[PDB]
Design a protein around this ligand. Sequence first.
Ligand SMILES: Cc1cc(CCCCCOc2c(Cl)cc(C3=NCCO3)cc2Cl)on1
Ligand SMILES: Cc1cc(CCCCCOc2c(Cl)cc(C3=NCCO3)cc2Cl)on1
Lengths: 19, 19, 19, 253, 253, 283, 283, 178
Amino acid sequence: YFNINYFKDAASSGASRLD
Amino acid sequence: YFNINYFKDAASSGASRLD
Amino acid sequence: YFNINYFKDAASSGASRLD
Amino acid sequence: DRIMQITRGDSTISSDDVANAVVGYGVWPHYLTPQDATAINKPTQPDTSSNRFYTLESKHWNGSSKGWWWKLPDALKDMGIFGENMYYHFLGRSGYTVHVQCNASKFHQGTLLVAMIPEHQLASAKHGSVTAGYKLTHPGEAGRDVSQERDASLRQPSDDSWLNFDGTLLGNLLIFPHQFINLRSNNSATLIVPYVNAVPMDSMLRHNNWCLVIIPISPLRSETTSSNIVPITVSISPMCAEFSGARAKNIKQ
Amino acid sequence: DRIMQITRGDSTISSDDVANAVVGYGVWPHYLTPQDATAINKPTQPDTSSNRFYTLESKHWNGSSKGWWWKLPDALKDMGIFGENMYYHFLGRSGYTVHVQCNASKFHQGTLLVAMIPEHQLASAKHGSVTAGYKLTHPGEAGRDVSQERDASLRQPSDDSWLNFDGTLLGNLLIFPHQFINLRSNNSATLIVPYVNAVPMDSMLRHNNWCLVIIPISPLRSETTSSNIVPITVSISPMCAEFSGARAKNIKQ
Amino acid sequence: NYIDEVLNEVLVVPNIKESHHTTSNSAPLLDAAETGHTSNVQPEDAIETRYVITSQTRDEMSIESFLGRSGCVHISRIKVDYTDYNGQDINFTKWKITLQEMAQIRRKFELFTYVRFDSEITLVPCIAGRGDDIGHIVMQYMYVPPGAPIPSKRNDFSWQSGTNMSIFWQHGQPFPRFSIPFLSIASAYYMFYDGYDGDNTSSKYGSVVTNDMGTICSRIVTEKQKLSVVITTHIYHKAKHTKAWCPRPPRAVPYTHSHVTNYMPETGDVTTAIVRRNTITTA
Amino acid sequence: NYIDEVLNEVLVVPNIKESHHTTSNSAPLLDAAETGHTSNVQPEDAIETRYVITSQTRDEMSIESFLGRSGCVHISRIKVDYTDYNGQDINFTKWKITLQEMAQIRRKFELFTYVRFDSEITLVPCIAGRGDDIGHIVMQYMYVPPGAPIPSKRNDFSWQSGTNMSIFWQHGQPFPRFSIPFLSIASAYYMFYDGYDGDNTSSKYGSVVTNDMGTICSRIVTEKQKLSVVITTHIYHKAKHTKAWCPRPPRAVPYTHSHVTNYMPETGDVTTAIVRRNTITTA
Amino acid sequence: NVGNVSMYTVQLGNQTGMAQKVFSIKVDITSTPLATTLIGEIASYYTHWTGSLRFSFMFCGTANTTLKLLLAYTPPGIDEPTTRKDAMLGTHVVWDVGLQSTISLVVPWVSASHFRLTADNKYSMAGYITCWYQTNLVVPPSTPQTADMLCFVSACKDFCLRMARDTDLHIQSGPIEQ
Ligand SMILES: Cc1cc(CCCCCOc2c(Cl)cc(C3=NCCO3)cc2Cl)on1
Ligand SMILES: Cc1cc(CCCCCOc2c(Cl)cc(C3=NCCO3)cc2Cl)on1
């Protein structure tokens, strides 16, 4: 389960990723 | 996540879009 | 229903499997 | 066939009679792998000169005997080379071979239970939170118990057998790698055991991984002259010894 | 370029200045071959844990200094592991690396002649057929001479330098593997030396194969405070050590 | 997989074949147990068996259904005070990370030498009303690894958890639960140990030199209330994704203290579960 | 990705190869640190290393797991009054937008010159009952950017939020949380600054000329109640999707005041964490 | 010394005796003098540490000056060595002061537990490092006879930390005003 930005804005999202 | 108008009527929906 | 590790980390997950 | 031959150093042992041999957890002792490792230095691996057949101090098997144990990383704190490399290095890792010899005649009756035990945290003889003392879980070739007497001032373990010294009905002890010495068939007991521990190489001084126990189950019974003494002799062989974390030298105690 | 780096054990040595290095008889030290061998047992070869960079006791370079020697098989009769394996085994064989460090400033003037010598049968200081004593050709890290005083009751060698202690005009000594330490260019001296002896493996106790000598040729001369002490430090590394003929253990002396 | 896993038929036991009589040489019933090995004899060997197709799974006999069950391992208690709030060492709990502090489950592991696992963890706060109204009693649990500022008292600076974990539970909202990675510098958790702190004839020896893994300093955030209370936040623990190495004989003597084996009761003779018989002849 | 990300094996560290001895010219152990650069020497260089395949991730050593953790940055308090409701500057809180108003976390950033992030934000109201019954105490938080009508007192006209954000929390319903874009006219948040307001020998100088970003005027909507209360709404903050530029030496002197560096304690000698030794010779 | 800068320099002295000792510190990276260091200051943000470490020393001596120190890493197991010989027996590096100036000493990773605790712990004791004279500090005429050496510590690619936790090295026995 993931990438389901339930919210529109980007500022709202999980902790980013890593690379 | 989106376009899941959980409700029937159109009056009920998120803030429209932009174009 | 399964394999939906709603959480990121692995330490968080159901009881493992069997094999 | 029962006969067995074993060669470890410059040393060899024979036995014209035996009860197979046992490999602890069905794993054969070997050297550490660059996968499970952690340290960074090149381990010194004395071959032969170290992992050879050292024989300890012998003991008497009494009709009053109660049992005796030796703690391995420790039993050879004096056995040349191995037992020096122990003291010169921080990290030590090694597996063993235990040859337990105890003969008498076919007119004798007796039974010895031999067992090795990973992390044998003994219990103190005294109620409380006081743990056994160092200096007493570090006997040496000589081993411990016999059925001996001692200061109760010392944070002294349990000389108590039936509870396993750890307080687990001996008899479930059969879960640890073991075998007996039924004087009517047997002659020896041979345990072989790899390196078991949550760490790739531990402190040969602070931590004793293997603990060995020999316990008279059915009491020795002859009809001979008590001039006839039936010792019990233990012989051991570090195997795949590996050391590292070289430096000054600890100190004897 | 003069800088040099050497790595032998868990040990490494550096030198921001040097006079090449020398390989004794142009042969690099290595392990014994099943051709020239003789013994029958599998030699123990402590790697790293043994053939590493041991540094001895340091010494003072005086305007009254006369010279000092160390005998190799012997200088490390205490150096951990190597020097235990020595005592536990009959046959021992090994080659070395000698790092001789001695700095001072570019305002100092001095010259040290360093040399190794196969079979350095010293002469006694006293006329006769009495050979030097054991106990005195077996000094240890500490070395011998300095310009010291001692009992003439002891079957004592020749503290005599110019004769080479063996009675060969020092100066022809240049025939043995050597180099100097001319404080105006040099900093150290590095000798590397294989195993030379009519036998594949000798007695590490009775026989010292290599003998090392350091002799002040041109006397140390500064114009500084004699608060400025200019030591001389020797470091050694058994290389390709190999042992065999395991057993009890000799005894210290 | 499903069916086999839903029907729970993953680890099935063999069936008992049919036998006939044997008037033959090799006697399987005879082995010498001194070899330390275990016999291999079966029904079919000893008797004239029939034919039973089995259907018993050894699923529930897995270190995960043996271990993977929540158990009280600690009962944090706070007899609040309103008289002196804050003060040193008050109204906030702290407790050393471990298991041996409470039986039944301690028992259970100890069945093995080494163990490894991700732990579940659940908190069951229960608010006892000693007043005529409990208000809104918020709560803060958190975890203090080594070496870390452990609250001296109730509002330190450590309750800011700028980089620590603090779970918050407010009366009504359900039980707090969460999980955790396997925390050990070692490849496995040492249930036991035959090591010490050092050569100091006064050094520590046990499971314990190897388990200083925390502590928990607690807090009831809400501030001063009128009508008193007492909070009892129960700490349950579950082992998920477990492994075990080298089984041991179970414990038969009621312990005392943790991180030790010690049984030697205060005076009372050492008691065990074994029962006494009049005679071996009749059971 | 998954495995690597679930197993947390994204940033792995190299292993320690095997070495042999070196009786050679180039001496890697010798470099001149005056170049201001950093040495590059390793185990394998200095010793006769072995071979260890590593397995440690530098995942948790990422500006996101270093920064991305919630921390108390403010504790809004309201000692209600029923005597005078409304009145000027009462029963409603307002507080200037910032971090430096409270350590542990202030500390943490300050480790870098510039920083940028979307902020999480959570509110943890705790209602202390000073009465025999707290009723239903609704709440209104909101945000007053510059220049905006900041409530003079409790019911202004600004609590209509016709175009502002006001989050509402009613006793029972969980903690209010929300998130936020990176608010700065600048490409990054200035943790520091070596600028001033102007040439006015009375101008401001610090982190601060560049951070007038708000304030928060608070409100307990419910009206007049009977039995009193005191509300303490804790403000936690988390940094999600963070970046950092030009690291700095950590802080070792307990600060005082925010938007300033000033350490100079009130009388007390400036204290630091360094400990004193009797002698260098023994540690 | 401590509240000043000197608190950073180590003067290499006279030494009437020979083979004498300079200093020592212990390796447990969360232990003053270490701790405060960019590393230490940090490590104190995590519960566990691991890998090798690097100690570097620099000669703020003179040009015409000369010396040779012996630095050593005494792994965990025993007591910080009282004597050089005893310490030379383990991990070390002879340092020849010269045209270079910086010698970097590596601290291999020797441990039982793949990982060590950042918090003071008798178990996870990393050991000691010490420095002694190999030769001396010789200076030709009219050059000072004491001089300093600066010392530093950076990590190794070995290195890695975990289990974030709040720091040690900073108690805000404040508050903080406005
Ligand atoms: C023996 C033995 C067994 C174990 C297992 C140890 C597992 C750690 C306990 O896990 C918890 C942690 Cl790390 C934190 C909290 C916690 N509750 C509120 C804050 O932190 C609770 C538990 Cl059960 O250790 N020695
Ligand atoms: C230094 C430094 C660090 C920062 C970060 C500033 C981030 C802004 C704070 O974010 C909040 C906002 Cl914009 C509003 C509210 C809010 N709570 C109730 C109403 O508004 C809370 C927070 Cl933490 O600024 N200077």
